[model samples]
Target: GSEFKKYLETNGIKPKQFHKKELIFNQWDPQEYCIFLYDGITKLTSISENGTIMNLQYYKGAFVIMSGFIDTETSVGYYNLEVISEQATAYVIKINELKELLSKNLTHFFYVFQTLQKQVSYSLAKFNDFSINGKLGSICGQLLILTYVYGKETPDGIKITLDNLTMQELSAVSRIISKLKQEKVIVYKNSCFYVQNLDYLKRYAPKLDEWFYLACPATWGKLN
Candidate 1:
């Protein structure tokens, strides 16, 4: 945090906030704004090339320390953005300001790179799960795939436990699933997950960082 604080002070960045319903930042668009959640819950949504709407990620003040808008090289100008919440707030910084900030500190620089990988993880979910460059980004969509693959659908949503898959396979989702179960939005019994209400599930999304930002090719690698 001291380093982050130094970055802001180093850049002389007096942060500013903006509210929104829908905001789409296309690829190769000018690197104008650097938006990080200084406040409020921000919902991140995207639209596929085929016009499929997706709730890809949701980042709270707890997760994202930084992000800009969208990556054209990685997204091919197709990625989109939306911030849905009760007055979702974000810090918007100038492109040069972020560049200058990155230049000043290597630690801060790598921190941004780390943030990018988190976003890419959610992007991987999009590409691999539903289809080649698929539409679905929700875990329910993921579980549904697991469900109907074996059991036929009932009038209700698919009913099944996650025991069939390794815990690590679904480890990233345990917090979200546990939260829902604790809230009684969904239930678990006899190693089976019950469908209580998916309506409440819609309230959750992935905590993806960045919609518009760029990373050096070296940092954007297969792995460390």
Candidate 2:
């Protein structure tokens, strides 16, 4: 937080705070600002035409949310951002202001650029998983991504510390869990998933290697 925090303070930018379960923005909402998440978790969710909701991604802070920053013509509403952590702190900078900030700070620009690339790749990875390995594979890819982002080393395996998994995912994921358990690939205990075999999961989600950028062990704040 040191490098980015310095920029915020120097620029006199203030952070907006939100409690758990608060909506940051809605899908197709007129977009005006980008959220520089300072701390806490926020989920990206979308509702289909038939009204089925899906939890697409989770951004554990120290990242920038700039879906409509560059393209002001389009509404920033592919997904709705909702705080999942106990609380969240963010700097909501207008598109014009963010561009000015980026222009002034090359380091922050690089960080934001890299984050945007990963976000695109993540969406594509999910599509690839479903196309190649079907629904189970896509879910497996998601779990592996979660492990990469939030995993902690334990005696037996990599333990994921994510607490609130979406309800829609749970129904299908429970079966996947049982199957993985039977094959000795993962262990579910005390409401958390521990990956016992990384190689086994790689077989299901072979494209997972591309998402290694998501592993930020130094900022493992989500792990309590």
Candidate 3:
């Protein structure tokens, strides 16, 4: 991953740091740059005409803005809002230049394709969660995702590294946390979550096991 950044750096595309709560891309804004995020978290959301904000996804780690590859011509989409949740460092490449680079060279395209595939896989899993499960189940699915992204296996269990929340959303999440605590499935200590029984959580988010990527493809021989 650093190799790609090194190539970009050598080619005059430098990485820039973005602060938390910074708007990387606002709704209805024209797409001019493709951001290659190698670190931190970004929240994808959309605002309704009545000014209600709805979150679509949380992208952390190495990611590419797939929409930037296409010419938007100022057209808009539902997941157009992008805001930083943690400090991020990324290479903001001009879309035109990025397209040219990919067309002339396919080496970096392979990595970009892998990133896109992983994003799609996660989106499909989340969709499966929302479509087939209840509110509690969906939240469990999200927590499972967090474990996959930031978990560290230790003597106790998988430890959550970081910690959202709106009121309507908060109430449901709070109740679920309380329920899990009562059930002894998860433990909260030092402002972090340690999941003791992933099997218990897996019952709520079955797709995490069915989907190959969500199940940790790194150990599955090869990533396709």
Candidate 4:
């Protein structure tokens, strides 16, 4: 909102800078103030009890609020907020002022809360599915569906930009498909893993197809 912009200006939140992968908030840190993201993306993740970092959500744009204001006391929330871009800026608002602002705009505040809840639920659901359906082919299929939705189609094939993913990150994704290959649900050759018959995988893992439909209904309809 314009009011938020005005409030930020009045609060003396200048265009500060932050590097990529910088920690904006650490686990158990005191909930200080709300940050309104002006640009770039930030990943909210947390180390699980098993020491695995679970990606919770991402925030971008001018009106995104940080989690500190929402949850006071300890910031030991589900996610550790980190800046993802080389440089980013945000307007910081004191907790009390943020609460007052939110109170003045109840509808916006509720909508924001609902949106965050949906994101949390979706992340949880995806994690549960990934844990149970630990098949590599299913993982690859899910990635393919996501690529089709958010990536661009190239002359050779669909092109997906992984940015700066490490070998471990790539392995995490491919490991699921590798397990599926062992089960004969897919085949790998020349750096490409092919679903020998997507139907076969669909038969064994119906949720894989369901996720594809959820990701891109048009693709599902065309296939049907």
Candidate 5:
């Protein structure tokens, strides 16, 4: 902890005052510095060309701002990161300083950069899947798959806790699942739609894995 604190102070970044829901960067904004999360959660969202919003990543603690920090000419394009919780804090590290640090510590930097790159690529792939498919059962199945991957098991099967999804969200997922039910790909019972045959669902729609993998690699790999 002291080591990290000293590193920040050495970099000339003073712990700044916090603000609520501030727009730190926008799509196509110049990427002058990398934002390192010191505390709280931040959500990265993709706004389409037509202005539709898709939630991408919810990151907390020690995550780097990936897209805009490297290239000034190339913006995030369709995506932007927003501060979701009021307690969030991040350090802005200048691009030149970051690069110099990286050059001196090439191996560590390579590992970090590769990891972040994989994350961004995976998020983009999942966004593409959600946009193209727009189906509910697939979404639920995808959610279940995610649950199984990251969730702790309760007495009632694998418990996937979604703290923020509303009834409208459930409805959106259910509506899509309903369409698949009509096609006999899934069945509903006791308010839960059992994905009748995962293989069948996969055959019916292959892109689900692509999106799933992008969103949750650990879970996706576990499913397979």
Candidate 6:
């Protein structure tokens, strides 16, 4: 987003690791390092019997995982991702090194962690939506998530603008695109989509209750 990698590198935030494809960063994979994806259209596809992945209909990470007081490994990998884009690249930081980034470098530390939480929540919810809802519901579900999950706004857009949809948008994208625009939920411009209204976007999900949100529960008082 906005060539995010440039800021890190220019500021000397070198990746602890370098990654490419087959690197979808599965949820429980013992991978370390907070990742920054500057290229490719990423999607959460399940690993199949053949061991190759397929894009689960219409689309669509920034986090190794998470860390906390409860035995935190601190690397969440954004519910896992597989790049559907024809070309892709990324920057990663070592697992153990996060502390120094947080403690030693205030700016980059905030830079790194801010995205992990919201985006992690977003990806998990989107994958869950794809799994449960009627495929039609997913069209709204995907765009709503896209609004929160990707893109930088533009002055010309002067509204909610999203970009970098499918590094290569799936062939079926046209179908969903036509439907949403007709409904006036979003407008596509300059390879980006400007959300006309989010309130309406949320309504697109027929069963919002079953859709995804932060997994937080009201109580965690004890762990038997």
lDDT of 1 by residue, 141-179 (tens): 444323322222345444553334332223546675676
| Model 3: lDDT of residue 172 | 73
Candidate no. 5 TM-score: 0.57
**RMSD vs true structure, all candidates:** 13.0, 3.8, 3.8, 5.9, 6.1, 9.5
Off by over 4 Å in 1: 1-6, 20-31, 45-56, 62-80, 125-137, 140-224
Q: In candidate 6, what are the lDDT values of residues 81-135, reduced to their tens digit?
A: 6555556555665555555555655665666555555455555665565676556
lDDT of 2 by residue, 114-154 (tens): 87887787677767777888877877887776777777878
Winning model by TM-score: 3
- Model 2: pairs clashing at backbone N, Cα or C within 3 Å: 28-77
Could you tell me every candidate's TM-score relative to the true structure? 0.45, 0.82, 0.83, 0.58, 0.57, 0.47
TM-score of model 2 (CA atoms): 0.82
Taken over the whole model, the C-alpha lDDT of each candidate is 0.47, 0.75, 0.69, 0.57, 0.56, 0.51
Residue pairs in collision within model 6:
64-75, 64-76, 64-77, 65-75, 65-76, 65-77, 66-74, 66-75, 66-76, 67-74
Best by lDDT: 2
Q: Which stretches of candidate 2 lie over 4 Å from their true place?
A: 28-31, 48-51, 71-74, 164-170, 213-224
Q: List candidate 5 segments past 4 Å from native.
A: 1-20, 28-31, 38-40, 46-62, 67-79, 120-138, 141-150, 165-171, 177-224
Task: Looking at model 3, report the run of 10 residues with the lowest lDDT sum.
Answer: 162-171
lDDT string, candidate 3, 62-121, tens digits: 777754544542333545535455568778877777776776668887777777777677
